[PDB]
Amino acid sequence: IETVPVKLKPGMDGPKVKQWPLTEEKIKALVEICTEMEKEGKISKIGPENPYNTPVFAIKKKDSTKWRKLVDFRELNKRTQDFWEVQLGIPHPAGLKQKKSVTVLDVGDAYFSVPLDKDFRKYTAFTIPSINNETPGIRYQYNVLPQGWKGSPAIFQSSMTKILEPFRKQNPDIVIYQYMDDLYVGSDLEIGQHRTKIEELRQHLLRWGGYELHPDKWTVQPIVLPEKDSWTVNDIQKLVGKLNWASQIYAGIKVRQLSKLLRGTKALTEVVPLTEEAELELAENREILKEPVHGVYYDPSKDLIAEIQKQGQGQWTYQIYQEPFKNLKTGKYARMKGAHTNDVKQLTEAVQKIATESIVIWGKTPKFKLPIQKETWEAWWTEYWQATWIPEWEFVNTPPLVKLWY
Amino acid sequence: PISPIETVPVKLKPGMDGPKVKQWPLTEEKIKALVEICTEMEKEGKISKIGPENPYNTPVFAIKKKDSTKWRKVVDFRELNKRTQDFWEVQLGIPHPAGLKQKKSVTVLDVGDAFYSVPLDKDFRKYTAFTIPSINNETPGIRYQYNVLPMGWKGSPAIFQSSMTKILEPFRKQNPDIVIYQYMDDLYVGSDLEIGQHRTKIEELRQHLLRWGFTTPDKKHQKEPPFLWMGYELHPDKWTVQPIVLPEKDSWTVNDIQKLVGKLNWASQIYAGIKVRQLSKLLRGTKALTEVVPLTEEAELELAENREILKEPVHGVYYDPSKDLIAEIQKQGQGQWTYQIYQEPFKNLKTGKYARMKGAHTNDVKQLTEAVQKIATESIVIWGKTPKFKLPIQKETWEAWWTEYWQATWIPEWEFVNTPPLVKLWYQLEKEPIIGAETFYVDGAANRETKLGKAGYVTDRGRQKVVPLTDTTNQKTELQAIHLALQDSGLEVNIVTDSQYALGIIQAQPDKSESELVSQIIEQLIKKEKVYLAWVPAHKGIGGNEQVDKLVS
DNA sequence: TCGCCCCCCTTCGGTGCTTTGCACCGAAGGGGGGC
Ligand SMILES: Nc1nc2c(ncn2[C@H]2C[C@H](O)[C@@H](COP(=O)(O)OP(=O)(O)OP(=O)(O)O)O2)c(=O)[nH]1
Ligand SMILES: [Mg+2]
């Protein structure tokens, strides 16, 4: 095969990101995976005269309890040329979110049959660490299309189409969408019939080289307003401050005849009767929150952003938008491992679930705004990561003013 | 000998050329020290004479070696280093003796003239041009280039380490039950073989090294405990740090205090309970390393405590993989924490401390979590797993924290240990307003142009106040309005502010702060019995809020 | 009058916010230790 010429974006250099500490069992898995990859010529040992580096770690899904190497090429991908400019990009089918069951397949191994541009290989270097620094780090670089690299689905695309054409010809009603190393494959068949045709797709692949999602239950959680029989002063300034904030999202929401039902310097526990002109304003605003916002449309030219708030008792609310206060989607994530007591595991799982929904719906992951300290996240998140991709994120400390989303 | 290993190709950064900087004068003792090293380096092929076709130069000097007799030739390649390509460093960290396992047979070996046994990429050699002065002016100095890795070049450590890793790899593959700790050119070699077979393997490793050009002189060849290694002393059963000598002065400069603190941090890895907060504060706001700084009373006490700790003998033990790792933390006051990592009681693997102040406003629970995270990261590095924790915080204190705090947080498997002072929340804010308690509507505003401001409140019991403020900010005024409401109210209070900023700080239940104003608010929160704190948006004419907003105008 | 690595404590300056200071964070100064 002949390799495709690949370049970084103009004026950018390759990634230079330090390896973080790894547990003993992740290091041993990496050593065995990399040693085997090197025998097969997919990677070559390199030295320190290559100045680039990308962190490496390993994950182990339990209902496939062998280790998966994960290189965090997020930096390299940001600096790699766009294949939209080269017109090699994958299109996203609008029908996948309509299916009732979507199974995720890890097809990352297909990339290892295509060589990588020799002049680009140096940018893919990574370093395996050493328990108690017994040795210097051991460095490798890729000779073939790496897993997790933006360029690999783009370069492999026409090969991927030829591999899949017989299956989607034979199944015109099943929708398959490639996102990086993954295939998202959706259908409307009965749950055991869906799984049967997944196994058929797997073995048509094995001849060349997860669990079930349901788009059908991803409820949107709207802004709700409390329902009571009697209303305190505090209940009403908690309601007014919440609607004043929603007035940036929705249209024509007023608080003028509830604003000064609080007339005067009154006690917070003093019960105020609702006027007929406040019950009028309350239910009108209550409906405006029942029906979705008009004028919000996805724009594939712009990035997606996700915000998450911790609500307690395992509940996590989230919004996905591209422009502030124009939410394409609002939601609520809840889990019950039964241990009941790990915030970081819950947030890490919430991030994978939300990112998965964006892939299914729009074909890319959002940049997350995470309600956690950077160092708390970085101490633990890899212990709970199960996806072959990693989204972009940043860390925010935003105290709740309103409890808008609950 | 020069290794027959392949050179590593190295480049200058693009557009850059080589260094052209003149040699400086040096003493006769160092000139003849270098002439002896240089004329013998030429005979061993380490350097080669060069002439004027080579336009580059870089100055050279010499320093003493810990074996006092020997000299170390060193070149001031700071200019060449700037112009040399970047490297990815393969030395990721420092091996620690607490990560060693007990071994029946131990050897420590060191390679002679290590850097000089690794050849340098041939196309690069011309940029290493230097000159040996020889009394400076009776002659224009003799000029050489390096054929091997120079001491002082930015690339030499990584290229040596990488090369040493390649040379060792055949021996490690053939000998998986022999542990070789490889730090630069220093090799710790441990095995569970009887001394006779162990020495056989050592001779075999030494012969393997010599066929790749790496001598192992007998001087640097340790075979009997205690082994001197990485600044420690390795016994069969235990390890110690090599003696730590603290500076003792009548007058202390900034630079002296800096060295003292550094010595203490180094000691903290095995001496439990070291503290450096009061000595470190003496460095704040100083402007010269030779400035004299008088020890405060608190720093003298801290120093005296550290000295009493340092007079007692201590030792670490080695790692037993078949037993759990346990990490125990104690609170020391003023954001200082100390910890011990052990497997069996009263036999520490190592100790340490955490005393960083992160953020302007924080609390003990947050800092405990930071300590936990530091220890967790260090244990992954040293042992490849995280330990079980013993922490001086009640399970109910923790559960109260991670439910009312809006950020995700977590501590791994841990057990409560009753070692006062315990970590606790110093106050809580009521989730619901409090019946019968006064209701304050607070507000503050300042003028950004004139830094003049006002803070005040109104009250459902009809109480109102307004205080003028000079040299303030918008955010300070709002903190002040809350300050006054807490000041003028009983043990139970309901407060209403329109400052998201102020609510954000107080809602995180801080117990300490870099700001004296926030410090004062914290002290008042701690003295209260119940406080409910509520927010409403500004400038929308909301009852109570609008009235105090009007009054502060 | 040098190099590379890890650690801690202090200081400085860039970033982004529906800001006008403020809090966050990475880098660089000093120190310890290793070869
Ligand atoms: N640039 C520089 N490199 C050093 C220094 N100290 C040690 N190294 C590097 C270069 C040395 O070759 C290597 C091994 O340290 P050694 O003290 O064992 O020196 P070396 O092996 O060259 O001579 P030796 O025969 O062991 O006395 O580590 C130093 O102070 N400056
Ligand atoms: Mg040596």
Numbering used by the authors:
A (entry chain B): 5 to 213, 231 to 427
B (entry chain A): 1 to 553
Could you give the paper's own sentences about this structure?
We also determined the structures of HIV-1 RT4M complexed with DNA:ETV-TP/dGTP at 2.32 and 2.30 Å resolutions, respectively, as reference models for comparison. In contrast, the bound ETV-TP/dGTP are well ordered and superimposed with each other with an RMSD of 0.2–0.3 Å, and their average B-values were similar to those of polypeptide chains and DNA (~ 60 Å2), suggesting that the bound ETV-TP/dGTP is rather static within the N-site. Due to the concavity formed by the Met184 sidechain, the hydrophobic pocket is expanded toward the side of Met184; the interatomic distances between Met184 CG and Ala114 CB are 8.0–8.8 Å and 6.0–6.5 Å in the E-CFCP-TP and dNTP complexes, respectively. Superimposition of the bound E-CFCP-TP, ETV-TP, and dGTP in HIV-1 RT3MB/4M highlights the deviated binding of the cyclopentyl moiety of E-CFCP-TP; the cyclopentyl moiety is shifted approximately 0.6 Å toward Met151 and skewed by approximately 10°. We anticipated that comparing the structures of RT3MB and RT4M would help us understand the structural impact of L74V on the N-site, enabling us to predict the compatibility of E-CFCP-TP binding to the HBV RT N-site.
The structure of the N-sites of HIV-1 RT and HBV Pol are considered to be quite similar, as the amino acid sequences that form the N-sites (referred to as motifs A, B, C, D, and E) are moderately conserved in both.
